[PDB]
Amino acid sequence: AEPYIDPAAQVHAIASIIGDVRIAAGVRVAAGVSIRADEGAPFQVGKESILQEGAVIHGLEYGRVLGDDQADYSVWIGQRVAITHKALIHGPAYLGDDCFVGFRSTVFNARVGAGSVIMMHALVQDVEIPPGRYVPSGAIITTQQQADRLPEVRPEDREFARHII
Amino acid sequence: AEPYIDPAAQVHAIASIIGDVRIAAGVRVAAGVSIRADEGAPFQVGKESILQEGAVIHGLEYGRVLGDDQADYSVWIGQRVAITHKALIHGPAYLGDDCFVGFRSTVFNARVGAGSVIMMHALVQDVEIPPGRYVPSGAIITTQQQADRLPEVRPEDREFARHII
C-alpha cells in the first residue's frame, strides 16, 4: 500500500512514487518522474536502475508478468535498466536487466529481454523482445513477427546507451 | 474565466484546470493533467470522459469547432471520450462521443467523428476523421485523403479501448 524505498536509493524530493512499489538499492529517480501502482500493482525497480525526467511507470488493473523472483508484477524492471526522458512503461511490462529505453519510447503489454536497446521515439506493444535485440529510433513494434525479426544489439549500441545514462 | 466543475466530476487535487473549461458529470481527471483555456477558450469535457496522467488540453487563441450544442469551442470533447497517458488535444479540436485517443497521441486542428479509435503514438492534424474510424499506432494523419481512407473500427478495437480506460 506504501512504497518500499531502499535506504541506498536516490529518489528526488519532487518524484511521485505511490502504492505498492519496491525501489532497490542504487536506483536513481529524477524530479518529475511518476510511479503509480494505484491501479495495476505491484511494481519492482531493480538495483541501479535510472529513471529520468518525464518518465512514467503505470499499470493496468489486470494483467501481470512473472518476475525473476517467480512472483507476479504489473511492472518488473530489472537491474541497471535505463528509462530515459519521457519514456512510458505501462504494465503489464517486463524489462530485463541492462535494458535501455530511449527518449519518448513506450513499452506496454510487453516483455523485453535482458540487454536490449530500445532507441528514441519507439513503441513496443503486445510482444516479447528476445534478449539482446535493438529497436531502432521511430520503430512501431506491435507484432511478434516484427519482434522476432529485430537485429541484435552491437557493442556500439551499449556504448551509446552508457553515454546517455 | 473560471472552470465550471460538475459536482459529480472526480478531478484529482493535483490536476491543473484553468480558464473557461466546463467539466461534465462523471468526468475523471488524473493527477498531472493540464487543461488551460488561457489562450484558446472555451473547452467542454462531456459526461464520463476520462483524462489520464500526462494528458494536456490547450487551444490556439483563434480557430474554433462547432459543439453539439451549436456553440463554438476551442476544444469540444464529447461524452465517454478516453484521453490516455501523454495525449495532447490542441484546439481547434472536436472529439465525438465514445472516441479513444491512445498513449502519446495528438489531435490538433481536427474533427474526430464519434466512435473513432486512435491508437498509440499517432498524430491527427488538419483533418476530419469520419465517425467510427481506426487510426493505427504510429500513424501520421495530416491530409483529408489519408483521413477519408482510414479503416473502420471493429468490435475488437472498442473492446481494446475499454480494457485500457
Binding site: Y94, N109, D126, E128, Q144 | -
Partner: peptide, 15 residues
C-alpha cells in the same frame, strides 16, 4: 486480455 492466450503467455513468462 485482447491477445491470443499463447501470445499473452510469451509476455507473462517468455519462451
Amino acid at each position: 486480455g485482447w491477445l491470443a492466450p499463447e501470445q499473452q503467455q510469451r509476455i507473462y513468462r517468455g519462451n
